[PDB]
Design a protein around this motif. Structure first.
Motif, PDB file in Angstrom:
ATOM      1  N   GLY D 471       0.873  -1.173   0.000  1.00 19.35           N
ATOM      2  CA  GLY D 471       0.000   0.000   0.000  1.00 19.35           C
ATOM      3  C   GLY D 471       0.900   1.208   0.000  1.00 19.35           C
ATOM      4  O   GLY D 471       2.109   1.154  -0.203  1.00 19.35           O
ATOM      5  N   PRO D 472       0.272   2.364   0.251  1.00 16.95           N
ATOM      6  CA  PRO D 472       1.031   3.699   0.227  1.00 16.95           C
ATOM      7  C   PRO D 472       2.082   3.824   1.359  1.00 16.95           C
ATOM      8  O   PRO D 472       2.814   4.821   1.302  1.00 16.95           O
ATOM      9  CB  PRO D 472      -0.128   4.701   0.459  1.00 16.95           C
ATOM     10  CG  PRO D 472      -1.443   4.017  -0.089  1.00 16.95           C
ATOM     11  CD  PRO D 472      -1.212   2.527   0.347  1.00 16.95           C
ATOM     12  N   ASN D 473       2.100   2.891   2.326  1.00 19.41           N
ATOM     13  CA  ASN D 473       3.125   2.960   3.323  1.00 19.41           C
ATOM     14  C   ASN D 473       4.188   1.927   3.094  1.00 19.41           C
ATOM     15  O   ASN D 473       5.173   1.885   3.884  1.00 19.41           O
ATOM     16  CB  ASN D 473       2.493   2.836   4.694  1.00 19.41           C
ATOM     17  CG  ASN D 473       3.443   3.157   5.818  1.00 19.41           C
ATOM     18  OD1 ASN D 473       4.051   4.264   5.807  1.00 19.41           O
ATOM     19  ND2 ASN D 473       3.630   2.249   6.805  1.00 19.41           N
ATOM     20  N   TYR D 474       4.114   1.093   2.062  1.00 13.41           N
ATOM     21  CA  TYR D 474       5.271   0.231   1.710  1.00 13.41           C
ATOM     22  C   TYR D 474       6.443   1.210   1.435  1.00 13.41           C
ATOM     23  O   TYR D 474       6.213   2.246   0.761  1.00 13.41           O
ATOM     24  CB  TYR D 474       4.900  -0.582   0.455  1.00 13.41           C
ATOM     25  CG  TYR D 474       6.032  -1.466  -0.044  1.00 13.41           C
ATOM     26  CD1 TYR D 474       6.305  -2.727   0.552  1.00 13.41           C
ATOM     27  CD2 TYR D 474       6.830  -1.059  -1.104  1.00 13.41           C
ATOM     28  CE1 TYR D 474       7.372  -3.533   0.114  1.00 13.41           C
ATOM     29  CE2 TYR D 474       7.869  -1.850  -1.585  1.00 13.41           C
ATOM     30  CZ  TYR D 474       8.105  -3.062  -0.946  1.00 13.41           C
ATOM     31  OH  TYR D 474       9.140  -3.897  -1.442  1.00 13.41           O
ATOM     32  N   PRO D 475       7.610   0.996   1.997  1.00 12.60           N
ATOM     33  CA  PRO D 475       8.585   2.090   2.104  1.00 12.60           C
ATOM     34  C   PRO D 475       8.888   2.751   0.759  1.00 12.60           C
ATOM     35  O   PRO D 475       8.888   3.991   0.660  1.00 12.60           O
ATOM     36  CB  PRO D 475       9.879   1.435   2.689  1.00 12.60           C
ATOM     37  CG  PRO D 475       9.248   0.328   3.617  1.00 12.60           C
ATOM     38  CD  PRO D 475       7.944  -0.145   2.900  1.00 12.60           C
ATOM     39  N   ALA D 478       6.168   5.307  -0.566  1.00 15.38           N
ATOM     40  CA  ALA D 478       5.454   6.253   0.397  1.00 15.38           C
ATOM     41  C   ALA D 478       5.401   7.701  -0.105  1.00 15.38           C
ATOM     42  O   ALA D 478       4.722   8.511   0.577  1.00 15.38           O
ATOM     43  CB  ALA D 478       6.213   6.187   1.693  1.00 15.38           C
TER      44      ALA D 478
END
Ligand code: F43
Ligand SMILES: C[C@@H](OP(=O)(O)O)[C@H](NC(=O)CCCCCCCCS)C(=O)O
Ligand SMILES: O=S(=O)(O)CCS
Ligand SMILES: O=S(=O)(O)CCS
Ligand SMILES: [Mg+2]
Ligand SMILES: [Mg+2]
Ligand SMILES: [Mg+2]
Ligand SMILES: [Mg+2]
Ligand SMILES: [Mg+2]
Ligand SMILES: [Mg+2]
Ligand SMILES: [Zn+2]
Lengths: 442, 548, 246, 548, 110
Positions: D471-475, D478
Motif C-alpha cells: 500500500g502507500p506505506n510500503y517504504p 510512500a
C-alpha cells in the motif's frame, strides 16, 4: 570462519595497517570496537548548561518562540558547573568505579555525559541515556540553588522541553545522536536515525572517518533489522569493508587516480578495469562491439562497485567542494555502470532508486532539504540497505560552505561533545585495530 | 445584587430558584420540546427516504420526564435548548475548529537568509509585497509557473490567504495593509509593546489553508499545503530556477525549521498528526482566544472566554468525537459557558482575592492555595445547596466539579500570578468537594484528580511540566472530560491578572488577531450563540458545485 | 569504456555524447558575454558573487581525500552554485534528458546533474558553469528549434512543433527569424528580456536531425529493433530481480 | 475499430490526431476557457468582499499559450476541463473518500459470545433485529438510556447507519432485510458462493458514521464512534446494567478484537491515525471498488475502474493534499482515467495474452514477464509516437510512464494469474520506456522503479510482501505520484481474469456492496463525471443549520 | 496452504502453497538456528514444542549488545525461518513472498 575472504586494512592516509584480516573480524557481531562505538552512541548525551541557564532566566521554555511571563529564574548554573556536574554524576553512575563519564567543556557551558553501559544491559532500548541524564541534572540544579517546589517545574521544562505533552523533547537543552524510538520508520531502525550532519560534526569533517562512522552505523542497523542474516550476510560485510573501511585501499587508490582531473565516468572505467584484473568479473558474451560482463560472485562485484561509488562521490563532490551533487553521483554512477557492463548496480538498483528520490527531495518544493539533514531512517533515503548514506556523509565532509543547513547550523552542540570521544571521532582507526586483534579468533 | 445565574434559572423553571420541590411526568415527554419535535419529524422523513429506520423517540427510554431546559449562553441574552450547542448542530463551533486546524505560522527569516546568501539576491519591503501578492494567488490552489495547470475554484477557497506580522513598525507600515496583522492596531499599547519586543525584526507568515480542504483531509495537511505554495511563490517572486538545490532549503524551513504548528502529533494509541486538538497545549489555546486584547480590564471575562473556547473544542469535538463519538459530551462542556454560573463563582473569587491580597500580590505558596481554593470551593458548593434549581440545572457531578474547581483554580492564580499554584488549587477543590457531598464526577472523572496534587510540582520525566506547556496529551489528562478547557482557563488566569499580552506563545497570540478569520475569536461565547441560532455562515460548503 | 549497447545510429550517438574523447560537433559561435546574458545569473562586468570565502583563506585540517582531489576553479574562488537547464523535443532533438546527465558525469567535473521528462539541469560553481555552458550551447548538444534553454515554464518536450518547426515555449525565449532562417534568443533562461538578442544560428534540417538524434521512435529507428540494447535492459531487469531474492 | 482514444483527440484539437504541427499563442491565454473565465470573475468578487487579493490570472506565467484541453472521462461521454476533476471542485470525489473514511466493519461474533457465555442470554435473529433497530437510532447520535440527552439533528446525519451480513443464508433471511446486505442479491452466483463460504456463520456489521462528523474530525474517529453506539445499543437491546464489568468486553471487541479498519495508522514522519488514505492497502482498495460484481465478464473494465478509484484517492487527495497540497496532482491521476487511453492499451495487452497464452494459462515466471510486459510497453509507446495529439494530451512523462506500465503490468498478471509477476512487468516497462525515449517521469518518479525489480520477489523484513498486501506505506511507495492507484489495478487484474470474488479481504468486498452509500462504487468513473458536471449530491452539508 | 495472510479475514485466492512444515520441523529449525546464532555453541536456543507445531527461539544475547533496542529478536527470527522454509522445500522466487507474508504478516505496509 563461515566465509574464507580476507581483506587488507589501511589508515586514513592510505598506509597499510594489517594484511589478510578475515572478513568476519570486521563484523558488527564480532568486532569489539564496533560494539564500543554502538554502546557509546546509545549512552552519550550532550548537556547545554548555558542553554538551560538562559532558558530559565528568560522563561523561554517549551519550544520555538515560547515564553511564560512571570516564571523567570536567574540561577548561576555555569558559574557552579563543577558542583552541579559532580552531583549529577553521583545520580547517573551505578557504582563509583564504573564507566560513567561526566566532563565539563567550554568553561562549564557544556557537559559530556556517558551514562554507564550497565544501565543499558538491563534496559529494552536506549532512552535511559537522555532520561537518566536529564533528571540527574534537573535534580542537581534544584539541589544546588535550593529551588522551591513552586519553581522547580521550570528547571524540568528548561532541560527536557515540552515532553510529555509533545512526544519529542521539544525545546530540550540536551542532545543525542539518536532520536526517540517512536520516530523509527520500522523496528530495528534506531542506528539509522542519526543525521548525516551529526556524523560529519563528530568526525571533524575528515572524509574517510565520516564515511567509516556512517557505514558502521548503517551496516550495524542492517544486522539489527535482520537484513544481514543468512543469504545476505556476506554481501553486507563486504559492503562494510570495501565501501566504508577502505578495504584493500580500493577507495583510496581510486580517488588518488582520479582526484586531479577525474569525473564519475573515469572512476567507473577504473573500477571495471580493477574488477576484471582481480577476477571479480569476466566477459560472458560478445555482442556487436560490446562485451557483456558476468560474475560468479555477486556479493564481491557489489562491494567493488560500492567502493567505486564512494570514490566517485569523493571525486565529484570533492572537485566542486559542494555536497549537493551527491544525489546525482549516487544515481548516475549506478545507471552508467549497468550500461557499461551488463551487470547490476550497487544494491541491485536500490542505491540508484534512493538517489532518484533523494535528488528530487533535495532540489524541489515538496520536502527533504540539503544533504546534511538526511539519514538512513528518513523516508527519502531508507531504501538502500547501507550503501547510500555513507556517501552523503563523505560529501558533506567535503562541502566548503555552500549549505544553509550545514553541520555548524544543525549540529554545533553534538560537535562540541561527541567529537571529544576518540572512537566516535576516528572510528576507522579503532575498528581496524580491533579487527587485527581478533583476527585469529575467527 | 442577584447572583449572576438567577436570570437563567428564572427562565428555565416556573418556580423561584430557591424552591425545593416541583412536579414531573406531565410534560408529554419529548413533545414538550420544539427541538425534539423537529427531530422526531426529521427521523421519520429520513427513514422513509433511505429505507432504514433512524431516529425514533420510542426506542430506549422516554426523554423529557423532567423539564428539558433552555440554556443561556453566558455573557449573552441568547437562550437555546442544549441540542443547539451540540457541535454537529452548530456551524460556529465546527468553524472555530476549522480556523485553528487550517492555520499554521511560518517564518520568513530563514527564507530571506537563503535568498541573500545562496542566491545572492536582495529582500526589501517591495520584494515582500510582490511575494505576498504571489502567495495570495497561489495559496488557495492556483498556479504561477507551469502551463496547463488546473486549479481550485476561487469561491470554494475564499477563506484561504496569507498575512504577515513583525515587530519592526517600519516594515509593517510599508507593506499593503491588506496583508498585515497590525500589532499596533489590534492590541492596546502596553500589550503591543510587549508583543513587538518578542517578535523583534522577525517577520512571520500566518497561513490559512481552505476550510473545504481541511474538512476533506486532516490537520497534518496544513503545514504541507502552506509549504507547497510558499515554495511556488518564492520561485515565482524571486526568480529561482523552478526547482534547484536551493529550493530545498525553502521547503525544509517552511515545513520544519521555522514552522509553528497549532498542535504536535500524538502517540500511536491515539494516533493523529499535527494540528489536531489533542496536540494543542493549554497555553496555545489561551493565546488563540482573543479575549485578552479586548477585555483586558476584566481578567475574569478573559479567563472565562478561554474556558468556553477550550471546553467546547477539547470536550465536545476532541473527547466527544475524535476520542469517542455518538451523542457525546455537549453538556459536560456547556456547564462551563452557560447560565453565567462559572462567572458568578469566579467573580466571587476575584473579589475575595482583590480585597484580601490585591491581584498577583499573594505569596506564591501552599498557604495561598489552601486559603483561596477552599474559600471559593465552599462558595460554589453552597450555591448548589441554596438554589435547588441550580443543582437540577448542572445535574451531573462532573459538571459541578469542573465549574467549582475552575473558579477555585483561576482565583488562586489571580492571587499568586502563577499558574502552577492555580493548578494545585484546582485539585484541592476536587478533594474538598468529594468529601463535602460524598460524590464528585463520573466513574472515571478523578483519575487525574487523584494523581493531581502529587504531579502539580513533580519534576520527573512524564510528570513534571508548567501548566502552560501541558495539554490533552499530558498523560494523566489524555482521557477524561471536565478538565482540559478549564485548565486552559487556569493557564490564562494569572496572565490576565498580570496584564500579560500572552500566556505561552506570542506568535500564536498575534496570529489570531485577524478579522478575516471566519470565526470571531474575540467573542467566542457570542459566536457559539450565533451558531446555536442558525445565524452563523461557515466556510467550506459545496453548494456552488452541487445542484439547486 | 563501452558506454551503451546497440547497433543503431541512436546508440552510437548516445555513446559519442558520453565519450570525452569524441569531439562534439560545433555548430554555432556565441560570445562569452552572450553566454552570461543567456544564463541570467550576473550582469556583464559584475564580479562573481561568493557563497563562502576562497579555499586558501580557510586553512582546513589535514584530510587525505581533499588533498588528492583538485577543486575546480570556482570552488577555489568560493563562487555561488548556479545552473543551466535545457528542454529537448521528442521530435528528434539531438540530445535528450538521460543522454545529458549520463554524458555530463562522464565529461564534466564537480557536476550535479538532474534528469526529468521536460527539463534536464546541471548545477556547478558559477565560473565553471559558464565554460561548460558555452560548450552546451555551441555544439550538437543543442539545436535552436528542437531544444530550449529554460529555467522555468518548461512545457514543450512532448508538444507538436509550430509551423516554423520550433518547439513550444510558454515564454517565447527563442524566436525564429523567417528573414534569416536563424533563431534568436530574446530572453534569458528565466524569461527576462535581453537588451540585445543573441544569434543561435539555423535550426538543423530533417536529415541532420535524424543523423544526430538520440531518441528512438517508430518514425526514426525504433528501440524494439535495436535488439542488442533491449537485450541488455532485459538482462539488467532479470539480474536485479534474482539478486534481490537470493 | 479506431483506437479507443481517437474520439477524444478529435474533440480536443482541430488537427487530425496524426498531424505533427500546430499553432500556438493565438487563443487569448485564459480567455479561451469557460472555467478559467469563471475563476477570474470569482477571484475579483472574493478579493473585493474580503479585502485581500486572491486569484489573479496575471500573477506569474500566462496559462493557455497552448490549447487548454477538455478530457473525456473514460467509459463515459462526458467531456470536461481538468479543473472539474480537481478534488476540491468535485463533490463526488470528496464523497468517495468520506464514504471510505467513515466506514468500519465490526464483528458480532465475539459480542454474541459475551452475551451467551458471560451474560447468559440467548442470541437469535429476532434479538439481532431488535439490536439493529436500536443501533440505527443511536449510531447517528441519539440517546437510548439517560435523561436530558441532547442529540444530533437527524437530517444532518441521515447518511449514518448500520447493516449486517452473514454467509448463512437462512440466518441472513431471518434478520429484518432493511438491515441486511444480501450477498445473493448483490453478487453473481459463483462469486456469491465464494463470499458466503469465506464468511460462513460469521455475522459482521458495516457501520457508517456521519459524513459531517468525518469532515469535522478524522478517520481515526470512525471505529471509536462506531463502538460507542454499538456499546449503548448492546446495553439497551440486551438489558444490561448501564455500565457493568461485561460492558468493557463489548468495547474491547468493537474497538480492537473484531474491528476491520479501512486503513492502518502511519509512522510519525507522516503521522496519521487509522482510516486515512495511506493506510488502505492496494488489495482493499480493489475490494472497495464494486466493478468486480457488475462487470465481471470484462476483466479489463474491472481492473481499470480499480485504477480510477486508486489514482484519484491516492494521487489527488492523499499525495496531492494530505502529503503536499496546493494546485496538486489532478492530471497525474486523470491520465489513468480519461480519454480511454489506458483502456486502449490494456485491451491490446489482454487480446495479446488471449492469443498467445489464454487468460491465466501462461507459466508464472520471468519468461512470461519479459514477453508480455515488453510487448505491451512497445505498443503503448508507439501510440504516443504515431499520434502527436496523444503525446501533447499526456504531456508529462510521469503520466505516460504510469499509463504504459499499468497496461503492461495488468496484461502480465492477466497472463500468469498472479499479481507478483504483474508487478515485475510494471518495473520492466519503466526500464524499457526510460531507454526508448531517454526520459521517464519527474525528478523523483523512479525511486521505487529502480528499487523495483529487486524488491518484487525479495523476502526481507521491510522489502518482501505480496503486492495485494502492499500500500502507500510500503517504504519505496510512500512519496510519489503515478504508482499507487495503478498498483491497485495490477492487484485486481489477475483476480478479475481468474473470476475471483475478491482480491484480499472478502469482508471489505461485501461491505461496499450497498446502495445506501452516497457514492456509487459500482461506477466510479461515471460518478467522477457526475461530480465534474456539478450534478453529484454529497452528504455532510450545513445548509439546514445556517442562514437561508 | 489457505493463502490466509496479512491480517484478520484476509486471503489471496490463487496463492496457496501446500508445504509440510510441521512434518519437517526438525530440519527447518536446525537450518534457522544456524542463521540465528553468531557462533556455534553460543547462547542461541531453538527448541521444538508440541510435536513440531511450535518453536521456542532465544536469539543470541550478543546480537543485542550490538543493537539499539530489541527488534532484532522478531526480525532475525522471522527471516531465519522464512529462509529455512524456502530452502527446505526449494520454494521458487515467484512464491517465496507468500512465506514472508505468512511469517511476519502485512509489515511494512502496517
Ligand atoms: C517548480 C517545479 C519543481 C517542483 O518541485 N514542482 C514543480 C511545480 C509544481 C506545482 C506547479 C503549480 C504552479 O505552476 O504554480 C504543482 C501543481 C504542485 C503544487 N504546488 O500545487 C506541480 N508541480 Ni510539477 N506538475 C506536473 C508535471 C510536471 C512536469 C511537467 C513537464 C511538462 O513538459 O509540462 C515536470 C517534471 C518533468 O519534466 O517530468 C514538472 C516540473 C515542476 N513541478 C517544476 C516546474 C516546471 C516548470 O518550470 O515548468 N511537473 C507533470 O508532468 C504532469 C502533472 C503536473 C502536476 C499538476 C497536475 O497533476 O494536474 C504538477 C504538480
Ligand atoms: C519526504 C517527506 O517530507 P519531509 O522531508 O519534509 O519530512 C514527506 N513528503 C512527501 O513524501 C511528499 C509526497 C508527495 C509530493 C512529492 C512526491 C511527488 C511529486 S509529483 C512528508 O511530508 O512526510
Ligand atoms: O457511567 S460512567 O461514569 O461509566 C460514564 C459517564 S458519561
Ligand atoms: O520538477 S520535479 O520533478 O521536482 C516536480 C514534478 S511535479
Ligand atoms: Mg572484440
Ligand atoms: Mg467579524
Ligand atoms: Mg461574524
Ligand atoms: Mg568563441
Ligand atoms: Mg511483433
Ligand atoms: Mg445509487
Ligand atoms: Zn477532516
Amino acid at each position: 570462519a563461515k566465509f574464507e575472504d580476507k581483506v587488507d586494512l589501511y589508515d586514513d592516509r592510505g598506509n597499510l595497517v594489517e594484511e589478510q584480516v578475515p572478513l568476519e573480524a570486521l563484523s558488527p557481531l564480532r568486532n569489539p570496537a564496533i560494539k564500543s562505538i554502538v554502546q557509546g552512541i546509545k549512552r552519550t548525551v550532550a548537556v547545554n548548561l548555558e542553554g538551560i541557564e538562559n532558558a530559565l532566566k528568560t522563561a523561554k521554555v517549551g519550544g520555538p518562540a515560547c515564553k511564560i511571563m512571570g516564571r523567570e529564574l536567574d540561577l548561576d548554573i555555569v558559574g557552579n558547573a563543577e558542583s552541579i556536574a559532580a552531583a549529577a554524576k553521583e545520580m547517573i553512575q551505578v557504582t563509583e568505579d564504573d564507566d560513567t563519564n561526566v566532563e565539563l567543556l567550554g568553561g562549564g557551558k557544556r557537559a559530556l555525559v556517558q551514562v554507564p553501559s550497565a544501565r543499558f544491559d538491563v534496559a529494552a532500548e536506549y532512552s535511559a541515556a537522555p532520561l537518566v541524564t536529564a533528571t540527574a541534572f534537573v535534580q542537581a540544579i534544584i539541589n544546588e540553588f535550593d529551588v522551591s517546589m513552586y519553581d522547580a517545574n521550570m528547571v524540568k521544562a528548561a532541560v527536557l522541553g515540552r515532553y510529555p505533552q509533545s512526544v519529542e523533547y521539544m525545546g530540550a537543552n540536551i542532545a543525542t545522536m539518536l532520536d526517540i524510538p517512536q520516530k523509527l520508520e520500522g523496528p530495528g531502525y534506531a542506528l539509522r536515525n542519526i543525521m548525516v550532519n551529526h556524523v560529519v560534526a563528530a568526525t571533524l569533517k575528515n572524509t574517510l572517518q565520516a564515511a567509516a562512522l556512517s557505514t558502521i552505523l548503517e551496516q550495524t542497523a542492517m544486522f539489527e533489522m535482520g537484513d544481514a542474516v543468512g543469504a545476505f550476510e556476506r554481501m553486507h560485510l563486504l559492503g562494510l569493508a570495501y565501501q566504508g573501511m577502505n578495504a584493500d585501499n580500493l577507495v583510496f587508490d581510486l580517488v588518488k587516480a582520479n582526484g586531479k582531473e577525474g569525473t564519475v565516468g573515469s572512476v567507473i572505467a577504473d573500477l571495471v578495469e580493477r574488477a576484471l584484473e582481480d577476477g571479480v568479473i569476466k566477459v560472458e558474451k560478445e555482442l556487436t562491439d560490446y562485451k557483456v560482463y558476468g560474475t560468479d560472485d555477486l556479493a564481491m562485484w557489489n562491494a567493488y562497485a560500492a567502493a567505486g561509488l564512494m570514490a566517485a562521490t569523493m571525486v565529484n563532490q570533492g572537485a566542486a567542494r559542494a555536497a549537493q551533487g551527491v544525489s546525482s553521483t549516487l544515481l548516475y554512477y549506478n545507471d552508467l555502470i549497468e550500461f557499461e557492463t551488463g551487470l547490476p548496480s550497487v544494491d541491485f538498483g536500490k542505491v540508484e532508486g534512493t538517489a532518484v528520490g533523494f535528488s528530487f527531495f533535495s532540489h524541489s518544493i515538496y520536502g527533504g532539504g540539503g544533504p546534511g539533514i538526511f539519514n538512513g531512517n528518513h523516508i527519502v533515503t531508507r531504501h538502500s540497505k547501507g550503501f547510500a548514506i555513507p556517501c552523503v556523509a563523505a560529501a558533506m565532509a567535503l562541502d566548503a560552505g555552500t549549505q544553509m543547513f550545514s553541520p555548524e547550523a544543525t549540529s554545533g552542540l553534538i560537535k562540541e561533545v561527541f567529537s571529544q570521544v576518540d572512537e566516535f571521532r576516528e572510528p576507522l582507526k579503532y575498528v581496524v585495530e580491533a579487527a587485527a586483534e581478533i583476527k585469529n579468533e575467527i | 445584587a442577584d447572583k449572576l445565574f438567577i436570570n437563567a434559572l428564572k427562565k428555565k423553571f416556573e418556580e423561584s430558584p430557591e424552591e425545593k420541590k416541583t412536579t414531573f411526568y406531565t410534560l408529554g415527554g419529548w413533545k414538550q420540546s420544539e427541538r425534539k419535535t423537529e427531530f422526531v419529524n426529521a427521523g421519520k422523513e429520513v427513514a422513509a427516504k433511505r429505507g432504514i429506520p433512524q431516529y425514533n423517540p420510542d426506542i430506549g427510554t422516554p426523554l423529557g420526564q423532567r423539564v428539558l431546559m433552555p440554556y443561556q449562553v453566558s455573557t449573552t441574552d441568547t437562550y437555546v435548548e442544549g441540542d443547539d450547542l451540540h457541535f454537529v448542530n452548530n456551524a460556529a463551533m465546527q468553524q472555530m475548529w476549522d480556523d485553528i486546524r487550517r492555520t499554521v505560522i511560518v517564518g520568513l527569516n530563514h527564507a530571506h537568509a537563503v535568498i541573500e546568501k545562496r542566491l545572492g539576491k536582495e529582500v526589501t519591503p517591495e520584494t515582500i509585497t510582490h511575494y505576498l501578492e504571489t502567495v495570495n494567488h497561489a495559496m488557495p490552489g492556483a498556479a504561477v509557473v507551469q502551463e496547463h495547470m488546473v486549479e481550485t475554484h476561487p469561491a470554494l477557497v475564499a477563506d484561504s490567504y496569507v498575512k504577515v506580522f513583525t515587530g519592526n513598525d517600519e516594515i509593517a507600515d510599508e507593506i499593503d495593509p491588506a496583508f498585515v496583522i497590525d500589532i499596533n492596531k489590534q492590541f492596546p499599547e502596553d500589550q503591543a509593546e510587549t508583543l513587538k519586543a518578542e517578535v523583534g525584526d522577525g517577520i512571520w507568515q500566518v497561513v490559512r489553508i481552505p476550510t473545504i480542504v481541511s474538512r476533506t483531509c486532516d490537520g497534518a495537511t496544513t503545514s504541507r499545503w502552506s509549504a507547497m505554495q510558499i515554495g511556488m511563490s518564492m520561485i515565482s517572486a524571486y526568480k529561482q530556477a523552478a526547482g534547484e538545490a536551493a529550493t530545498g532549503d525553502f521547503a525544509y524551513a517552511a515545513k520544519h525549521a521555522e514552522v509553528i504548528h497549532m498542535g504536535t502529533y500524538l502517540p500511536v494509541r491515539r494516533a493523529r498528526g499535527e494540528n489536531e486538538p489533542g496536540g494543542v497545549p493549554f497555553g496555545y489555546l489561551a493565546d488563540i482566544c482573543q479575549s485578552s486584547r479586548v477585555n483586558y480590564e476584566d481578567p475574569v471575562r478573559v479567563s472565562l472566554d478561554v474556558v468556553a473556547t477550550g471546553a467546547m473544542l477539547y470536550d465536545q469535538i476532541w473527547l466527544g468525537s475524535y476520542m469517542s463519538g455518538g451523542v457525546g459530551f455537549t453538556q459536560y462542556a456547556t456547564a462551563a459557558y452557560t447560565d453565567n454560573i462559572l462567572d458568578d463563582f469566579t467573580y466571587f473569587g476575584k473579589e475575595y482575592v482583590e480585597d484580601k491580597y490585591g491581584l498577583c500580590e499573594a505569596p506564591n505558596n501552599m498557604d495561598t492555595v489552601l486559603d483561596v481554593a477552599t474559600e471559593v470551593t465552599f462558595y460554589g458548593l453552597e450555591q448548589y445547596e441554596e438554589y435547588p434549581a441550580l443543582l437540577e440545572d448542572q445535574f451531573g457531578g462532573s459538571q459541578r466539579a469542573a465549574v467549582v474547581a475552575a473558579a477555585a483554580g483561576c482565583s488562586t492564580a489571580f492571587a499568586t500570578g502563577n499558574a502552577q499554584t492555580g493548578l494545585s488549587g484546582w485539585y484541592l477543590s476536587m478533594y474538598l468537594h468529594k468529601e463535602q457531598h460524598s460524590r464528585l464526577g463520573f466513574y472515571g472523572y478523578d483519575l487525574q484528580d487523584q494523581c493531581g496534587a502529587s504531579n502539580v510540582f513533580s519534576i520527573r520525566g512524564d510528570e513534571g511540566l508548567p501548566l502552560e506547556l501541558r495539554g490533552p496529551n499530558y498523560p494523566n489528562y489524555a482521557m477524561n472530560v471536565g478538565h482540559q478547557g478549564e485548565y486552559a482557563g487556569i493557564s490564562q488566569a494569572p496572565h490576565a491578572a498580570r496584564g500579560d499580552a500572552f500566556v505561552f506563545n506570542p506568535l500564536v497570540k498575534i496570529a489570531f488577531a485577524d478579522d478575516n478569520l471566519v470565526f470571531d475569536f474575540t467573542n467566542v461565547r457570542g459566536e457559539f450563540a450565533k451558531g446555536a441560532l442558525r445565524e452563523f455562515e461557515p466556510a467550506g460548503e459545496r453548494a456552488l458545485i452541487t445542484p439547486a | 569504456a563501452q558506454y551503451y549497447p546497440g547497433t543503431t545510429k541512436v546508440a552510437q550517438n548516445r555513446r559519442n555524447f558520453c565519450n570525452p574523447e569524441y569531439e562534439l560537433e560545433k555548430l554555432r559561435e556565441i560570445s562569452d558575454e552572450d553566454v552570461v546574458k543567456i544564463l541570467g545569473h550576473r550582469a556583464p562586468g559584475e564580479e562573481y558573487p561568493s557563497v563562502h570565502p576562497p579555499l586558501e583563506e580557510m586553512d582546513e585540517p589535514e584530510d587525505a581525500i581533499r588533498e588528492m582531489v583538485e577543486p575546480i576553479d570556482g570552488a577555489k574562488a568560493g563562487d555561488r552554485v548556479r545552473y543551466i537547464q535545457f528542454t529537448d523535443s521528442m521530435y528528434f532533438a539531438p540530445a535528450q534528458p538521460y543522454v545529458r546527465s549520463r554524458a555530463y558525469l562522464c565529461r564534466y567535473r564537480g557536476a550535479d546533474a538532474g534528469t526529468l521528462s521536460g527539463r534536464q539541469i546541471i548545477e556547478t560553481r558559477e565560473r565553471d558553469l559558464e565554460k561548460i555552458s558555452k560548450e552546451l550551447l555551441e555544439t550538437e548538444f543543442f539545436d535552436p528549434a528542437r531544444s530550449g534553454v529554460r529555467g522555468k515554464s518548461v512545457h514543450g518536450h512532448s508538444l507538436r512543433l509550430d509551423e516554423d518547426g520550433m518547439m513550444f515555449d510558454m515564454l517565447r525565449r527563442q524566436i525564429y527569424n523567417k528573414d534569416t532562417g536563424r533563431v534568436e534568443m530574446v530572453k534569458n533562461q528565466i524569461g527576462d528580456e535581453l537588451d540585445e538578442p543573441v544569434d543561435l544560428g539555423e535550426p538543423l534540417d530533417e536529415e541532420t536531425l535524424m543523423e544526430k538524434t538520440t531518441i528512438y521512435r517508430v518514425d526514426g529507428e525504433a528501440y524494439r529493433d535495436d535488439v542488442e540494447a533491449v537485450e541488455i535492459m532485459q538482462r539488467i531487469h532479470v539480474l536485479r530481480s534474482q539478486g534481490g531474492f537470493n
